Design a protein around this ligand. Structure first.
Ligand SMILES: Cc1noc(C)c1-c1cc(S(=O)(=O)NC2CCCC2)c2cccnc2c1
Ligand SMILES: Cc1noc(C)c1-c1cc(S(=O)(=O)NC2CCCC2)c2cccnc2c1
Length: 114
């Protein structure tokens, strides 16, 4: 579906996050071979990244905004679960997610199809 809320997530939320200076590690799926993490996919069962979310927005994959919000959430949660507490990537994820939440607080409240 195209909905008012999904449009907002695309044009306001994703727009802001995608261009952020800390976004780069999250713009494509985690490549476990490249990063040297043979257990990544053993620990993280549902990988997610902003490249995938952007494409889903662009291709009208989502039926409701809440679905897209859960993908954003999964991407951040994966990061917090996998990485060590002191890893810089955790700080970068937190920074992005703060913007995610700030923007989500201003999303249109009633979802309507277009
Ligand atoms: C401005 C304007 N003047 O005439 C038209 C037509 C627009 C308009 C309408 C929509 S929408 O109807 O698809 N979604 C609405 C629902 C919530 C707010 C946007 C946009 C959608 C995306 C970008 N520009 C949009 C601009
Ligand atoms: C693991 C992992 N789990 O979620 C994400 C996201 C990652 C992650 C981690 C690294 S890194 O640890 O090599 N560099 C850190 C240093 C500070 C920036 C990230 C990447 C390195 C390159 C590309 N993607 C990366 C993605």
């Amino acid at each position: 579906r195209v909905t008012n809320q999904l449009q907002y997530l695309h044009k306001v939320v994703m727009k802001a996050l995608w261009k952020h200076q800390f976004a780069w590690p999250f713009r494509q799926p985690v490549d476990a071979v490249k990063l040297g993490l043979p257990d990544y996919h053993k620990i993280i069962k549902q990988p997610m990244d902003m490249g995938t979310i952007k494409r889903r927005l662009e291709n009208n994959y989502y039926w409701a905004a809440s679905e897209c919000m859960q993908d954003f959430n999964t991407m951040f949660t994966n990061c917090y679960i996998y990485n060590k507490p002191t890893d810089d990537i955790v700080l970068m994820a937190q920074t992005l997610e703060k913007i995610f939440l700030q923007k989500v607080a201003s999303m249109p409240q009633e979802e309507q199809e277009l």
